[PDB]
Each structure stands twice: as C-alpha cells, then as structure tokens.
C-alpha cells in the first residue's frame, strides 16, 4: 500500500542525498533517498516522490 504514495509532493525536512534524508508525506515523517545519489535536495524543498522502496520514498524534482 506504500505504493499509493508514488506521485504524492513532500516537504524535505532533513536534507535528503545518497543514503540519509526525511520528508513530510500525507501528514507523516518518511525517510527518503534521492533518484539520482549526487543530487541533494536542502531542508525545506519540496520533491515528488517517483518510487518507495520499502517504506523508504525515492524522491525527484517536483513535477
Ligand atoms: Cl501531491
Ligand atoms: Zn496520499
Ligand atoms: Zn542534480
Ligand atoms: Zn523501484
């Protein structure tokens, strides 16, 4: 059921890159891990969410 989630918008709220990071998804914490490892997005942006892994989001640009 985690996989309803894919395509949801997330709030970043510790930063996320290659193997650590937090967001705010349906009003919850998630961990998440960025796409593309190299690319970290910062406190405060906001990512889409293009895959769960487990229960951990695979986020992107938002869009
Ligand atoms: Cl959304
Ligand atoms: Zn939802
Ligand atoms: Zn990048
Ligand atoms: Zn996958």
Not at 26 to 41: E, K, Q, V
Request: glycine share 10%.
């Amino acid at each position: 059921s985690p996989r309803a989630l894919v395509g949801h918008r997330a709030e970043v709220l510790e930063d996320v890159g290659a193997t650590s990071g937090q967001v705010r998804l349906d009003g919850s914490i998630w961990s998440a891990r960025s796409m593309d490892p190299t690319h970290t997005f910062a406190e405060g942006e906001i990512v889409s969410v293009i895959d769960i892994q487990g229960t951990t989001a695979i986020v992107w640009k938002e869009a």
